[PDB]
Design a protein around this ligand. Sequence first.
Ligand code: C6B
Ligand code: C6B
Ligand code: C6B
Ligand code: GPP
Ligand code: ZN
Ligand code: ZN
Ligand code: ZN
Lengths: 158, 158, 158
Amino acid sequence: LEMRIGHGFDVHAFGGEGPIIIGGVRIPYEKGLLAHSDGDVALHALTDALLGAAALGDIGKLFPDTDPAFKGADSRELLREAWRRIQAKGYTLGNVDVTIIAQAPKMLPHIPQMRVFIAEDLGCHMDDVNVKATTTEKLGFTGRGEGIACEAVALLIK
Amino acid sequence: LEMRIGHGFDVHAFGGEGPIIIGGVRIPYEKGLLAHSDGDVALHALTDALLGAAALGDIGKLFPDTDPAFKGADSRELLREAWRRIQAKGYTLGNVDVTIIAQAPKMLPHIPQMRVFIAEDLGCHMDDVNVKATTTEKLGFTGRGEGIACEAVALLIK
Amino acid sequence: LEMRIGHGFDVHAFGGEGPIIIGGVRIPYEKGLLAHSDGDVALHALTDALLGAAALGDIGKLFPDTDPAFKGADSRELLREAWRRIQAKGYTLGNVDVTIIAQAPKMLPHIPQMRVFIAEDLGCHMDDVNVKATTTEKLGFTGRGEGIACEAVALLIK
Ligand SMILES: Nc1ccn([C@H]2O[C@@H](CO)[C@@H](OP(=O)(O)O)[C@H]2O)c(=O)n1
Ligand SMILES: Nc1ccn([C@H]2O[C@@H](CO)[C@@H](OP(=O)(O)O)[C@H]2O)c(=O)n1
Ligand SMILES: Nc1ccn([C@H]2O[C@@H](CO)[C@@H](OP(=O)(O)O)[C@H]2O)c(=O)n1
Ligand SMILES: CC(C)=CCC/C(C)=C/COP(=O)(O)OP(=O)(O)O
Ligand SMILES: [Zn+2]
Ligand SMILES: [Zn+2]
Ligand SMILES: [Zn+2]
């Protein structure tokens, strides 16, 4: 039983009309998120943590914004595809932990649904998916309501 | 032997008269920390990493600022209580690592005491508790002396 | 088989003439990095994650900027020395994951070389070293091109 750790981080700036997509869930908000994809900060960061633990780089090394086969995809498709490739290397899920960093909107009413999505997408028990949120007390780009950041850690078994 | 990873993050803005409480230790400083609790950034982040690894959410899902049974509590009481509940689910401590991010005050004279507190609170060997500090070279809200951030990772055994 | 987790974080401000050193690799850029050492943000953060997992503190607790035996050293020497001391306590490498946070320069052409360096320095398979990069979408000190941050997680075996 060999175990492997992975870390992920992601940021998107606010812009345009709401809602926003975080952890798969459509959340109502005054602004939306500027992004090439659906801008799901929490799922990008989670994917990068998963891929990192499998030493497969990051999303931008598997699915280039520029090209070729994976354009106009929502972050759940990318998560599920990354997870196929991680399973292809003979890994199974240990567990994942996600930390959303945003002044607003309010995340925790939506966390149960984020966990349902992630557990479906990775085909695991909800009990192995943890998601949490925090503000930076009106400090920083995130606290000035300029954008949202997220951190993810993942553990994989072989 | 199943192992589980957890991550935590926390920020508090400076305000009011010093001292500040970081990792349990009262540290002298020109300003204090604005917070509902004692504002112990390092212990919040550690608790969230612990709870996250046990898939129990975060502090704000166990001990709502709003309510009900756990108001006006210092961060060590919250840490110790979270640790009871994590033990209640049959987990024991692997180890924890804490990273304080602050331009000032100077953290490392206080780290040995922070480790004594944390090891007591979690009833473990000092050898499983690591705490470190870093500045952001006068960059960012943290570098402009606006506040303090902290990151924690935790590993739990079952 | 006991396993241990570690986290690291590091920031350096831009200044002076390029190039910059990130993960051992000399990368061309309009500015350089202000630092006492070579300013290799990615290797500092990795070292701190490694040392943290071994409960040995951080670089600034093993190799004080002030003093005594380890001045004017490039970050690879420090990484290799920290790794001797971690091996001295009977640890072997699980794996490491690195996340560079910079608006520019562009990191991923250089990641393969960063992995060659790190794998050499820790005497491990490339397959246990993962490095990735992300921007913060022009947000924050990092997005305003003021500096570069990095995050590292490490896992150690005993
Ligand atoms: N300094 C930097 C900053 C970011 N990047 C990124 O290039 C992108 C790949 O198209 C990005 O992937 P990402 O969109 O964050 O999934 C990261 O690899 C990079 O390569 N160098
Ligand atoms: N966008 C956000 C940002 C922060 N939060 C927080 O609500 C708080 C619960 O009272 C907070 O918990 P915390 O005070 O960080 O322990 C986190 O869950 C949240 O729910 N949504
Ligand atoms: N509030 C803070 C912020 C940073 N520090 C740092 O002191 C330095 C040791 O010379 C630093 O180590 P570093 O240069 O980040 O490897 C960290 O321990 C500290 O001790 N207290
Ligand atoms: C790992 C960390 C620190 C996560 C939190 C992200 C955050 C709030 C950064 C602060 O923004 P900034 O310092 O990059 O920009 P500014 O100087 O405008 O506050
Ligand atoms: Zn993204
Ligand atoms: Zn707090
Ligand atoms: Zn440094």
